[PDB]
């Protein structure tokens, strides 16, 4: 039963994979689970890279705005 993001995302990946194999009309032929593994590896790598980039961009913009506000306050005080 779903408690965190992890259970929801693994359920959504499993259910989408089942739907995709259902549309393809594989019939009685076996379904290759290679697509699921490839998608999962791509998901973890891409979410790690995107989280790193987004956190770096956020702290970058935050320190830029902080420096600009500090300079504005220093100019206003003087």
């Amino acid at each position: 039963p779903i408690q965190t993001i992890r259970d929801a995302v693994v359920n959504i990946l499993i259910h989408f994979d089942r739907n995709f194999y259902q549309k393809m009309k594989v019939g009685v032929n076996p379904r290759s689970p290679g697509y699921f593994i490839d998608g999962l590896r791509a998901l973890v790598k891409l979410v790690t890279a995107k989280y790193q980039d987004l956190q770096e961009n956020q702290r970058f913009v935050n320190v830029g705005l902080e420096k600009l506000n500090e300079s504005v306050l220093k100019v206003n005080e003087l």
Partner: protein, 134 residues
């Protein structure tokens, strides 16, 4: 000069404020964007535009069923294909189609599994030859 620099940074300050405001929207979304990007990456290499649209709409409905957030205006090129990469692909000789750009981004973002190309026209053989030079 400092006063002029402060006064001229109105647009930059507005953009920074908009980015700070939309950081919550992006962080509420990032998992869903990564899921749909990876599904594009590993599922619709070998599908036409109609099948891609049907798969995408049923994926969007199913993803909204489990209540995880995603963009109402999400696109593959707007998320994975960068401006420098798009410039390089267009100057190599690729067409301007969104389908071709999506497939090109799918092919060049595969550092794990080798990509397979079914190009009847034999156009991106010389496009990729242009990309890697000599």
């Amino acid at each position: 000069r400092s006063i002029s620099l402060v006064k001229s940074l109105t647009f930059e300050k507005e953009r920074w404020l908009n980015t700070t405001k939309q950081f919550s929207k992006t962080s509420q979304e990032l998992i869903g964007n990564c899921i749909i990007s990876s599904i594009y990456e590993t599922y619709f290499g070998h599908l036409n535009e109609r099948e891609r649209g049907d798969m995408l709409v049923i994926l969007k409905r199913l993803l909204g069923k489990f209540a995880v957030k995603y963009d109402v205006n999400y696109r593959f090129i707007d998320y994975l294909v960068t401006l420098d990469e798009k410039m390089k692909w267009l100057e190599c000789g690729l067409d301007k189609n969104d389908y071709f750009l999506e497939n090109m981004s799918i092919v060049m973002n595969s550092q794990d599994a080798v990509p397979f190309l079914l190009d009847p026209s034999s156009h991106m053989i010389t496009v990729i030859s242009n990309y890697y030079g000599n």
